[PDB]
């Protein structure tokens, strides 16, 4: 919310050069000036013969900004044979990609071509060039003797790179081995010895890079952005690579270890096409000392209203815990096809509050379509989802989009003013912007008045300049300022008291004893730092015969403002306040309400407090309301308040309406120094009576019981605390679990069945019936363990009744049977026929959880046929039942359920 | 009663604080008596009813013509939507509803747009379809009458890692090498443009030829949106149906896949096809993102088809999930079965409708109610499917405003999804009374002026107040008799403001202006949900967090659409449960999941089927007559005499009747979604 809008640094390539497409901050340790460096791919050079070579410029800072280039190379192709170009250097995008660490410069050619060594062909294996102080090297690690396409022949090496803290480049090629991308890893130090100009593939022994894989791994295109941090505690950079078009294009990010290049983790986007892994940054957001991943999805497609898909973009911030794991959000974009997303700079901590701060460029966005930029700030709980500052795009577009933010760098104050600055690039006019941080101030401000409740007689002072006397008190104003940074030793506050707020044209109370007016302006002077150094004035009250309006509070009323032209400094950067800090502030008084007590009045509050919810659940949606009586016995409170105070973990949701017989509030909901309370809002002998809703959930695992306190704090002199009260709702675990099952219903001789002496398929038995069962937790509690028992006939009178075949279970549960599963390979109830027990142990189940059990038996036709013959019946049936025996809640009390169910089958021939 | 205790202070204020309130201005002024609360109340308390003030909202069709019936040649009197526009009074409060039919026009008039990847895997592909406008001409003319038929071919951009170029002569013959012979890679050429003479199709795809890609994924997207947006050059008929055809043997392209070969200038989505016919900004365009092919499909009405291979079906039906309206079939190796998956598809896109919003404002809110076949009615979903070809389904629709914003016209339309015709509603608000043509500011009806007579008590200007303006802040007279109290013993005001001379006025505010003759209400104190603040989809008025229509809810927390609740068999929330605000609650335990079809205790089919069975086999039963009994069956029913067990997962089932035969039946379902069924002709 501090970046300098009013005055960004202008940079200007040349025109149609794409000026602007990749940008870096150049911070060398060998002098005190730093510059931009700004990629040109398309810039025409000099080089002997060299089309659309591209170029790398120094754009300088304070200064007549002026944008001279890089000669990294000032040779064309070189030449393999009479007659036989070895390289091919025209339209090869040098300086899409550039980089820089220390006083080390890395841009890439990513579309560099050369003639293979083995034979006559064109490849765009890529390259790179290493600036490394007065040294020039050239870096091409995918010129080695892969050359067809299913090596490093189209390997287009330093799409991306990076450097680590251990000076070791990390460079992305999208296109080795078909397509599936590849991380090549090397030492700066060796990358320098190891060059010879005549060596076209060159051997480094300390290469870190990750080798083919299975032919599903193809068209990957790992390595489009990659990005480096600490991701297992080694110390050591681990690699972050985004791979775009993984899992059925989808998208991925691998994180391999910074080492030995092994597999370290794995992030899988939610839709296709979306390229997830576009961008990929690493910092921490949270200050945990934990990196922490963002990757863009710039082209997700996300449900609105009206269930319509809408292109904004997303992008996913994991934030990393000591165990091993990511916590996961997503933040989506704002308009439509903007591609929020496209581009993600970590900045540093942008205004110095603690925690680092973000960037997420929409480059099709804003007005008309020429870009905008977000900046978001981080907290403890990690990235706020509202940004706090919009950047704009100002260029009106031509051939093609301005492109406002399709590449930026941050973390580096380019002023030295104590706040890191950014750069975004505008390549489709080719244009690059600096947009300064300015100083972010903290303002504490103190409002106060000594009596705070005036007796309307108490005309202790004249008036000056006449004998009259009138009511009248003390008012103090007092501020204080500091921050970061660079700022000037002395500000200047403008402050401004009116002496009656709410009232406005209504005639004012209170006046200012040395005016005869409700306001007062005053310029003061705050150091930075210091003490709160400040005054107080006197105010009073006209007399009785003016106004009849006593009830009414007089509100004291403080704004304070600051000239920022003052603070502009040398550059013109001025500061700015900080952006949730108030710059407004109210008090309140009032009369005395003719209590005459002593001088004051004296209240009387008491509380109470029930609700229908005795005894309470673990965990679910939670209808927990809470009915509250307020009582005021004594004399008039003045901004009596009730506060409503809970343990650890509860929540909110507010307060009860429509409910007519029941006195409604505007109980509101804080949390401040650690502590989340309800405060809610009287005359003598006040009764109230009011509804709340409220969401309580178990999560410290000890008591059986939730509490709830109560407090009446008002502005009342003596009776400024009541005494505590405390509620209590109990715990309880109702795990409600069924049993539920069905048979085919009915079963009729089979078509063409002939009898064998033994079957050995299943159509020579009969045909197939099949039992079906389930055991659900319907209740608000989970239960640790159950049992269940099916009951079922087999034999009866010498006759199989039926013939079980094969089990069948969902669920984290194990079944066993009392009799031989299958006695024969193949490939009516309990009380009067010979019986079968299958009982079945099922583990953990949460609500809305369940087991389910498959049973498929045969039926043996040549008892029915004897049935048949001998002209009688059966009346198949079949049971089951279960009981629970443990609940994971040890702590809690335990309870026994047991239910049972019964099923049928008909046979007829 | 409620417009008494809040308005009363002007006729506008009485309009606009709720729908049923009214206003009576009559030149009598009849003291003593609320001027806001009712109409009947001011019918009663001799004020002239003349000068009673009460706009009601009033919706009434403009142009409408009957629907269609055979729209075999006819130049325009083909209709679609019966109503096409109508004219919506709101009155800044309410909401009314209005109906919309939409009809599935027999022989509609068909352009069907074959577009064709052109890799060498695509060679034997192309040997097939030498004979293919014959063949979709004999098959296409029992469905329409007015078919025209175009083709365009595509391999991939012909720039970096496509093909480049290459040191040998491959450039102008990449298949020397091969020791064959084929065209330069090319990435979109348009190649015949849509004719009504069939035989052309054939005369122009034999002498087509195919090129040699990197095998790779290929370019098609590029080609799709040219062949969308090029009106004029592929030759799109506005009222006929549009099938663009789009066949592929591999992986496609993406958006942002074009920086690898130098490409960053985004997919513009106008036509780039000259004179050539070949796609001009192949080498500098990027290729289409789903959201803008998506958008472009919308806007020429485009209905898309993927015939892809085996090898890639469950990407690109991943892929039809993402942009709605697109069908995806399976398509031989050698492309033999192309035309029967055309036939199918155009015989599916055709089967459902579906509504769609255009330039609704954020004021305006709708709420939808279908009624589809059989005359059952879904409330909740806009979207009707299962539709045959000559059917006609209705829609009723209800519009609410917020408030009225500063506009007071307005116009948006309701158009189905695909469809050439559609509805434009015009709305306008009465925002304002009628009276304010004779207001009369700073008159002597008003006290020394000061003020304005607006048709009725005079609005007192600043420093001025109390009916007739007799009072002023020079006077502050105290002596009140208006009951200016909201309770015994309760502050005057309420404390949120000041009684003068009679009546409260409210003072200074922070966030949210102050209304009521007590000072009893605001707009900042609205009840929120999870206590954040009133969502913003409805009205905040005295602590009352009212929502719209598409968004009610006792905090306006949950959507009352229904589009995710229905299954995909067709009908809502598997026939097990209902859509309460957005998820599907099922009455039935032993059953979960999304929309309930996941219950594994529920019984075979073949139960639910028997009562179908029994209602297409017999008349007999109250479901038959009642004809409900046809919800049931929608799977296609067939009467056989033999036993067609034959299948891989063919399902049988018996029923025993009230009668003394045994009743036989079967049914199974195959690749392309149509599920049949067979009845034995004679019980056994
Ligand atoms: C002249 C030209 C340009 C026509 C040419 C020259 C030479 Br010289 C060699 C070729 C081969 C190269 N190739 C070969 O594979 C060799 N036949 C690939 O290029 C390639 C690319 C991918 O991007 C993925 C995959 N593999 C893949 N594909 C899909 C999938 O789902 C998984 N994997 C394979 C060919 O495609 O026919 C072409």
């Known amino acids: 919310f501090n970046l300098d809008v009013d005055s960004p640094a202008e940079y200007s390539g040349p025109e149609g050069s794409y000026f602007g497409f990749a940008v870096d901050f150049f911070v060398p340790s060998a002098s005190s000036r730093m510059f931009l460096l700004v990629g040109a791919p398309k810039a025409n050079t000099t080089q002997p013969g060299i089309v659309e070579g591209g170029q790398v410029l120094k754009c300088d800072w304070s200064s007549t900004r002026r944008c001279q280039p890089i000669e990294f190379d000032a040779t064309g192709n070189r030449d393999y044979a009479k007659d036989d ?159 775009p078009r993984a899992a059925r294009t989808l998208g991925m990010v691998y994180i391999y270890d910074g080492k030995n290049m092994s597999s370290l983790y794995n992030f899988t986007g939610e839709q296709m096409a979306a390229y997830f892994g576009f961008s990929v940054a690493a910092t921490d957001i949270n200050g945990d000392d934990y990196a922490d991943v963002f990757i863009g999805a710039p082209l997700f497609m996300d449900r609105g209203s009206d269930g319509k898909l809408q292109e904004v973009g997303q992008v996913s911030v994991s934030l990393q815990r000591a165990s091993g794991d990511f916590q996961t959000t997503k933040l989506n974009g704002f308009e439509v096809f903007a591609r929020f997303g496209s581009a993600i700079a970590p900045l540093g901590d942008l205004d110095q509050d603690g925690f680092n701060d ?115 008190f003390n008012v103090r104003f007092c501020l204080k300022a500091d921050g970061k940074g660079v700022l000037p030793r002395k500000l200047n506050f403008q402050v401004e008291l009116l002496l009656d707020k709410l009232k406005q044209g209504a005639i004012r109370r209170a006046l200012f004893l040395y005016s005869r007016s409700p306001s007062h302006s005053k310029n003061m002077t705050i150091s930075r730092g210091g003490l709160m150094q400040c005054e107080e004035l006197i105010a ?266 094969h089990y069948d279970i969902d669920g984290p549960m194990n079944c066993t049977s009392d009799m031989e599963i299958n006695p024969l390979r193949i490939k009516l109830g309990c009380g009067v026929a010979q019986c079968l027990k299958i009982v079945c142990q099922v583990g953990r189940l949460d609500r809305g959880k369940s087991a389910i059990l498959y049973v498929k038996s045969l039926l043996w036709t040549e008892t029915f046929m004897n049935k048949e013959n001998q002209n009688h019946s059966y009346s198949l049936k079949s049971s089951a039942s279960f009981n629970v025996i443990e609940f994971p809640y040890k702590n809690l009390p335990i309870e026994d359920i047991t239910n049972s169910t019964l099923v049928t089958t008909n046979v007829t021939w | 009663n409620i417009c008494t205790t809040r308005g009363v202070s002007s006729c506008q204020q009485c309009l606009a604080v709720s729908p049923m309130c009214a206003w009576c201005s009559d030149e009598a002024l009849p003291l003593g008596s609320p001027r806001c609360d009712l109409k009947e109340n001011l019918l009663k308390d001799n004020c002239a009813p003349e000068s009673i003030e009460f706009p009601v909202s009033e919706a009434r069709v403009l142009e409408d013509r009957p629907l269609s019936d055979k729209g075999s040649g006819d130049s325009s009197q083909v209709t679609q939507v019966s109503p096409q526009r109508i004219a919506l009074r709101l009155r800044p409060d309410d909401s009314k509803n209005f109906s919309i039919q939409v009809r599935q026009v027999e022989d509609y008039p068909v352009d069907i747009y ?85 035989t052309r199709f054939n005369e122009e795809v034999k002498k087509q030829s195919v090129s040699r890609n990197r095998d790779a994924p290929e370019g098609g997207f590029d080609a799709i949106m040219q062949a969308t947006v090029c009106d004029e050059k592929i030759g799109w008929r506005n009222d006929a149906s549009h099938l663009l055809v789009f066949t592929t043997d591999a992986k496609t392209h993406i958006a942002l896949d074009g920086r690898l070969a130098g490409i960053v200038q985004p997919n513009d989505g106008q036509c780039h096809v000259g004179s050539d016919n070949h796609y001009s900004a192949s080498t500098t365009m990027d290729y289409p993102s789903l959201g803008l092919m998506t958008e472009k499909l919308s806007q020429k009405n485009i209905n898309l088809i993927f015939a892809v291979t085996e090898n890639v079906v469950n990407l690109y039906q991943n892929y039809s999930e993402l942009i709605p309206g697109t069908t995806v079939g399976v398509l031989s190796m050698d492309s033999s079965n192309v035309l029967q998956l055309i036939v199918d598809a155009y015989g599916k896109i ?234 599907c609650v099922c009455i039935q335990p032993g059953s979960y999941g999304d929309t309930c079809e996941k219950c594994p205790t529920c019984p075979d089919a073949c139960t639910f089927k028997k009562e179908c069975v029994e209602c297409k086999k017999f008349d007999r039963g109250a479901l038959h007559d009642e004809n409900t009994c046809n919800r049931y069956c929608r799977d296609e029913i067939e009467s056989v005499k033999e036993l067609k067990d034959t299948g891989k997962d063919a399902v049988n089932c018996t029923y025993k009747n009230e009668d003394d035969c045994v009743v036989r039946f079967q049914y199974y379902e195959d690749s392309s979604g149509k599920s049949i069924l067979y009845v034995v002709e004679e019980p056994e």
């Open chain 2, 114 to 198: 074959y577009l064709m990847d052109l890799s060498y895997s695509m060679k034997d592909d192309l040997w097939s379809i030498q004979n293919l406008g014959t063949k979709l001409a004999t098959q296409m003319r029992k469905l329409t009458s007015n078919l025209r038929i175009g083709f365009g071919a595509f391999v991939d951009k012909p720039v970096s890692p496509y093909m480049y170029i290459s040191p040998p002569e491959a450039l102008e013959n990449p298949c020397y090498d091969m020791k064959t012979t084929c065209l330069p890679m090319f990435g979109y050429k348009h190649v015949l443009t849509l004719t009504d003479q069939v």
């Open chain 1, 358 to 472: 973000i960037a997420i460029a929409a480059p099709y966005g804003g007005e008309d379509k020429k870009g905008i930029v977000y900046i978001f700030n981080g907290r403890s709980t990690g990235l706020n989802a509202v940004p706090s500052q919009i950047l704009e795009g100002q260029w009106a577009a031509r051939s093609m989009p301005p492109s406002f933010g399709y590449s930026m760098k941050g973390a580096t104050d380019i002023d030295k003013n104590g706040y890191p600055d950014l750069i975004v690039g505008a390549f489709g006019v080719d244009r690059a912007i600096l947009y300064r941080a300015r100083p972010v101030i903290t303002v504490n401000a103190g409002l106060e008045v000594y009596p705070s409740i005036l007796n309307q007689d108490n005309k202790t002072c004249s008036l000056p300049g006449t004998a009259l006397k009138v009511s009248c």
């Open chain 1, 85 to 243: 170009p070895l390289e091919f250097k025209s339209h090869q995008w040098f300086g899409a990609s550039v980089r820089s660490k220390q006083d080390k410069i890395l841009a890439c050619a990513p579309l560099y071509h050369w003639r293979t060594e083995m034979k006559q062909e064109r490849e765009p294996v890529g390259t790179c060039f290493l600036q490394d102080g007065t040294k020039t090297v050239e870096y091409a690690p995918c010129r080695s003797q892969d050359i067809d396409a299913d090596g490093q022949g189209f390997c287009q090496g330093g799409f991306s790179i990076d450097f680590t803290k251990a000076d070791r480049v990390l460079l992305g090629g999208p296109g080795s081995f078909y397509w599936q991308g590849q991380l090549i890893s090397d030492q700066v130090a060796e990358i320098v010895s190891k060059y010879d100009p005549n060596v076209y593939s060159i051997k480094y022994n300390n290469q870190l890079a990750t080798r083919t894989a299975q032919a599903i791994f193809d068209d990957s295109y790992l390595g489009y952005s990659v990005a480096v941090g600490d991701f297992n505690g080694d110390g050591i950079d681990d690699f972050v690579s985004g791979v």
């Open chain 1, 540 to 805: 009073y009250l006209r007399d009785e015969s003016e106004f009849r309006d006593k009830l009414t509070p007089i509100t004291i009323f403080m704004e304070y403002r600051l000239d920022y032209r003052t603070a502009a400094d040398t550059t013109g950067l001025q500061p700015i306040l900080n952006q949730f800090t108030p710059a407004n502030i109210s008090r309140q008084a009032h009369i005395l309400l003719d209590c005459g007590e002593d001088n004051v009045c004296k209240p009387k509050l008491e509380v109470s407090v029930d609700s229908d919810q005795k005894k309470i659940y673990i965990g679910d949606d939670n209808p927990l309301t809470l009915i509250v009586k307020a009582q005021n016995q004594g004399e008039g409170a003045y901004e009596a308040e009730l506060i409503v105070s809970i343990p650890l973990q509860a929540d909110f949701i507010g307060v009860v309406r429509n409910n007519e017989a029941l006195a409604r509030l505007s109980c509101a909901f804080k949390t401040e120094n650690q502590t989340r309370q309800v405060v809610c809002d009287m005359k003598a002998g006040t009764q109230l009576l009011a509804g709340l809703r409220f969401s309580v959930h178990q999560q410290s695992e000890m008591d059986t019981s939730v509490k709830f306190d109560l407090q009446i704090q008002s502005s009342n002199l003596f009776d400024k605390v009541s005494p505590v009260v405390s509620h209590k709702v109990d715990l309880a675990v109702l795990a409600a679990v069924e049993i539920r099952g069905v048979s085919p219903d009915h079963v009729f001789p089979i078509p063409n069945w002939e009898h064998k002496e033994n079957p050995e398929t299943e159509e020579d038995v009969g045909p197939v019936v099949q039992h079906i069962y389930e055991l659900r937790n319907n209740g608000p509690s989970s239960f640790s363990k159950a049992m269940l028992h099916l009951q079922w006939p087999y034999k009866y009178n010498n006759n199989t009744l039926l013939y079980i075949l």
């Open chain 2, 350 to 583: 055709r089967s459902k409708v579906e509504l769609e919003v255009r330039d609704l404002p954020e004021e305006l809110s709708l709420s939808f109610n279908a009624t589809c076949l059989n005359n059952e009615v879904i409330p909740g979903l806009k979207s009707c499917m299962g539709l045959k070809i000559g059917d006609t389904v209705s829609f009723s629709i209800e519009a609410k405003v917020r408030g009225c914003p500063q506009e007071k016209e307005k116009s948006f339309t309701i158009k189905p999804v695909g469809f050439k015709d559609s509805l434009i509603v015009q709305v306008t608000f009465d925002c304002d009374c009628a009276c304010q043509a004779q207001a009369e500011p700073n008159s002597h009806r008003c006290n020394n002026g000061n003020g304005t007579f607006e048709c009725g008590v005079c609005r007192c200007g600043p420093g001025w107040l109390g009916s007739q303006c007799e009072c002023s802040e020079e006077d502050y007279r105290p002596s009140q008799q208006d009951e200016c109290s909201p309770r015994e013993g309760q502050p005057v005001c309420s404390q949120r403001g000041e009684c003068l001379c009679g009546q409260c006025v409210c003072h200074s505010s922070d966030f949210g202006k102050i209304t009521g003759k007590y000072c009893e209400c605001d707009d900042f104190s609205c009840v929120r949900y999870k206590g954040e603040m009133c969502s913003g989809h409805g009205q905040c008025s005295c602590g009352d967090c009212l929502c719209d229509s598409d968004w009610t809810g006792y905090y306006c927390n949950c959507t009352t659409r229904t589009d995710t609740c229905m299954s995909s068999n067709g009908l809502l929330c598997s026939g097990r449960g209902k859509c309460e605000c957005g998820s």
